[PDB]
Amino acid sequence: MVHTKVVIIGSGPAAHTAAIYLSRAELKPVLYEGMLGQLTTTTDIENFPGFPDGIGGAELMENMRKQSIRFGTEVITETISRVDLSSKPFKLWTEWNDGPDKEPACTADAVIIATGANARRLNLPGEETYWQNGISACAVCDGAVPIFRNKPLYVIGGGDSAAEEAMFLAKYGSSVTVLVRRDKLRASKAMAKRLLAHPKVTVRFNTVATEVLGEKKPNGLMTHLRIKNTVTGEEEIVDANGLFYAVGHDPATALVKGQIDLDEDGYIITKPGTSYTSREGVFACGDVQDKRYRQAITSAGSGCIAALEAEKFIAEAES
Amino acid sequence: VHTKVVIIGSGPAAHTAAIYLSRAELKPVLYEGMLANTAAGGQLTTTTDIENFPGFPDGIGGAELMENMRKQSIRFGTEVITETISRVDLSSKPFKLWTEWNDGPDKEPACTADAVIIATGANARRLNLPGEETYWQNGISACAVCDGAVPIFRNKPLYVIGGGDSAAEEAMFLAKYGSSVTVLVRRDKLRASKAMAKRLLAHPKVTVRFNTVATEVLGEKKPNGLMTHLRIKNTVTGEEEIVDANGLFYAVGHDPATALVKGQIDLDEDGYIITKPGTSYTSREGVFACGDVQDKRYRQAITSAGSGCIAALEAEKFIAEAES
Numbered sequence A: 001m002v003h004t005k006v007v008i009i010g011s012g013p014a015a016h017t018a019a020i021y022l023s024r025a026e027l028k029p030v031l032y033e034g035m036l037g038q039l040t041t042t043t044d045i046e047n048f049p050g051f052p053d054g055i056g057g058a059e060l061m062e063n064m065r066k067q068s069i070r071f072g073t074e075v076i077t078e079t080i081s082r083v084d085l086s087s088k089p090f091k092l093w094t095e096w097n098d099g100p101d102k103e104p105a106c107t108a109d110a111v112i113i114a115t116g117a118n119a120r121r122l123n124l125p126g127e128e129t130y131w132q133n134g135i136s137a138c139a140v141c142d143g144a145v146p147i148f149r150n151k152p153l154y155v156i157g158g159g160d161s162a163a164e165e166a167m168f169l170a171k172y173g174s175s176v177t178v179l180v181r182r183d184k185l186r187a188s189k190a191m192a193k194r195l196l197a198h199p200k201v202t203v204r205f206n207t208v209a210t211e212v213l214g215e216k217k218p219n220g221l222m223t224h225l226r227i228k229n230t231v232t233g234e235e236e237i238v239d240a241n242g243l244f245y246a247v248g249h250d251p252a253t254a255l256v257k258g259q260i261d262l263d264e265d266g267y268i269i270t271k272p273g274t275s276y277t278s279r280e281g282v283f284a285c286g287d288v289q290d291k292r293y294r295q296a297i298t299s300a301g302s303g304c305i306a307a308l309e310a311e312k313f314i315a316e317a318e319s
Numbered sequence B: 001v002h003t004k005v006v007i008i009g010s011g012p013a014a015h016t017a018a019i020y021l022s023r024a025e026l027k028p029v030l031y032e033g034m035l036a037n038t039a040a041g042g043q044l045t046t047t048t049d050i051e052n053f054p055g056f057p058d059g060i061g062g063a064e065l066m067e068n069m070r071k072q073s074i075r076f077g078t079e080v081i082t083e084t085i086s087r088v089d090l091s092s093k094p095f096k097l098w099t100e101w102n103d104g105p106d107k108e109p110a111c112t113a114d115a116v117i118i119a120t121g122a123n124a125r126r127l128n129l130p131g132e133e134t135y136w137q138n139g140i141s142a143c144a145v146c147d148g149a150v151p152i153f154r155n156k157p158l159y160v161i162g163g164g165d166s167a168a169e170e171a172m173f174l175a176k177y178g179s180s181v182t183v184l185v186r187r188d189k190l191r192a193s194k195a196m197a198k199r200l201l202a203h204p205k206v207t208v209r210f211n212t213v214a215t216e217v218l219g220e221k222k223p224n225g226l227m228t229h230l231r232i233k234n235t236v237t238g239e240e241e242i243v244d245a246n247g248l249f250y251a252v253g254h255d256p257a258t259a260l261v262k263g264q265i266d267l268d269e270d271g272y273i274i275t276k277p278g279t280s281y282t283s284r285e286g287v288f289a290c291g292d293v294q295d296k297r298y299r300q301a302i303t304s305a306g307s308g309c310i311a312a313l314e315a316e317k318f319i320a321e322a323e324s
């Protein structure tokens, strides 16, 4: 709209819970969901409290969407291009309507950044066919799914996230193998000590996954993985029911890029347990600030925090 | 017996923590209590309809939400025992716990564990007025953010009890919906901050009535009868009066159920468990606290459920780094 109290950028649990609380407080919030959350790709969420029989990630975000629009959130399906966090009112620009001499599409006195932080994928051949049908990126979320229990599981990555998620997947899978592309695991020295000592995990140095094979049916599962030795070049097909990407994540902090303080890995720095960023007036909730948990129930919680602390900012600001 | 982690509580924090530990193939035991202190199930069981919980766009009853959250905990394998913890001994290597009425000076603990999660909640104080039981959640409430928007209070006279900052904060919040908001301070001057009192006395739709106490709650006499009148009493003269009131919101402080610890883990001035910000790490290594026991700024179920997951991951990480 032309002007509102608070504008929210995002479409995940943090962006919607903030919209729910902010709209129920009669504050008229506008939500920029984008021209398209990472939870929409998940097939079934079973670790969310209140849904004992599990819930599809697509309908969960649809429930949270209608719950936001119920209390009066102006949700416009447009992508934010640039943000001007320097003048008194924060200015926002739509994509394809950007530019140095264009009029902003929406301005507000406070903005919430809940743009998520997606896990990096490798875009292997067959990945699109078996994503969330055998391939995943969160060991805590999908590791307990029955399709991985007592089955061979494979992990991609050599960092600390790989070793941590590999030993976690050993609780369910019959065997866990980690495919580091180079030699000499990149992870910490102490965590690697317990990794190579764990019986149900084996690290395969100089190995890269080339393509994902599986069933070709409605909702086909993953059955085989084609791995390739990176020095000799001999490719082979091995049994694999689960492939977990364990490379780092990419926080969507592109819009700020200096306006708000960031950390070494790219996430938005916020006061712990709070949504207060380094610039007073803009708050950050969800995976943009969280790198240690990366859960929907935790992002939804921090989204409620960003809503309440924005209303305290707005209340103490007007006359 | 003996287990890896024991959880004390039955609220959203206690169950979300139990859900993640049970899905992680652990052996968590959840003690809902024998209707300990809010009955077994959490403080949400008293609320009639929760509309600000994400994932339920048409709202959900607090009773059914915690029952869904209960079966979701037992689904992944939590040993949920409906017994109340009386004493806890967090001095030896394994944490010892005793059931109520089975504590004894020299009795054997009912369950011991290497890590404990404290999600025992923090209930809002009630005044036990006459008619409160008849009109609780039918006109009476204790959270302005949760129930302030309910249609039965919109464009109606609302009353707030308390003189602290929580009173002034919740009173101005209720002004968004009610026709008029009146706050009943017991003594002769607001206990709140000078700046928070400034915005209170300046808000047009609120009026502060010093030296006034609510004595009785009046309303309809039907099965689901709403609140219609409130009997207030001037505390200097003693003259009682009956005024129109569709909503009564308690805004006195809260009571953390931190009685079992009482010194073992560090507490704050108001009684909440102090924890490292953004984490469930308490002052004693090995015990974690999630939910309203540590949260005094939000006091929401979605935030307690989130903090319960925080206590869940950091408890599972704590056990992993201990045996390996």
Ligand SMILES: Cc1cc2nc3c(=O)[nH]c(=O)nc-3n(C[C@H](O)[C@H](O)[C@H](O)COP(=O)(O)OP(=O)(O)OC[C@H]3O[C@@H](n4cnc5c(N)ncnc54)[C@H](O)[C@@H]3O)c2cc1C
Binding pocket: A009, A010, A011, A012, A013, A014, A015, A032, A033, A034, A035, A036, A037, A038, A039, A041, A042, A044, A045, A046, A047, A048, A078, A079, A080, A081, A114, A115, A116, A117, A118, A119, A136, A137, A138, A141, A142, A252, A255, A285, A286, A287, A288, A294, A295, A296, A297, A299, A300
């Ligand atoms: C494969 C995978 C599986 C997962 N499974 C689970 C699970 O089972 N249970 C669970 O609890 N969690 C799960 N998660 C975590 C999930 O990502 C949570 O939803 C996440 O923690 C919530 O992040 P968020 O609240 O910050 O918003 P997000 O869910 O990350 O939403 C991101 C939104 O930001 C929008 N956006 C970004 N930039 C812009 C911009 N300039 N302009 C406009 N809009 C923008 C995008 O449109 C996008 O929709 C999974 C994650 C992945 C990657």
Ligand SMILES: Cc1cc2nc3c(=O)[nH]c(=O)nc-3n(C[C@H](O)[C@H](O)[C@H](O)COP(=O)(O)OP(=O)(O)OC[C@H]3O[C@@H](n4cnc5c(N)ncnc54)[C@H](O)[C@@H]3O)c2cc1C
Binding pocket: B008, B009, B010, B011, B012, B013, B014, B031, B032, B033, B034, B035, B036, B037, B038, B039, B040, B041, B042, B043, B044, B046, B047, B049, B050, B051, B052, B053, B083, B084, B085, B086, B119, B120, B121, B122, B123, B124, B141, B142, B143, B146, B147, B257, B260, B290, B291, B292, B293, B299, B300, B301, B302, B304, B305
């Ligand atoms: C009238 C009212 C309305 C509310 N409405 C909403 C709403 O609409 N939406 C929302 O998100 N929040 C609402 N809340 C907030 C509500 O209190 C949340 O549930 C709370 O913030 C989170 O509770 P908790 O998980 O921290 O633990 P709690 O649920 O508060 O308590 C845990 C339970 O553990 C039990 N227990 C205590 N001690 C022991 C012991 N030794 N042994 C065994 N068991 C024990 C008790 O029965 C206790 O109830 C409302 C609160 C009130 C008072």
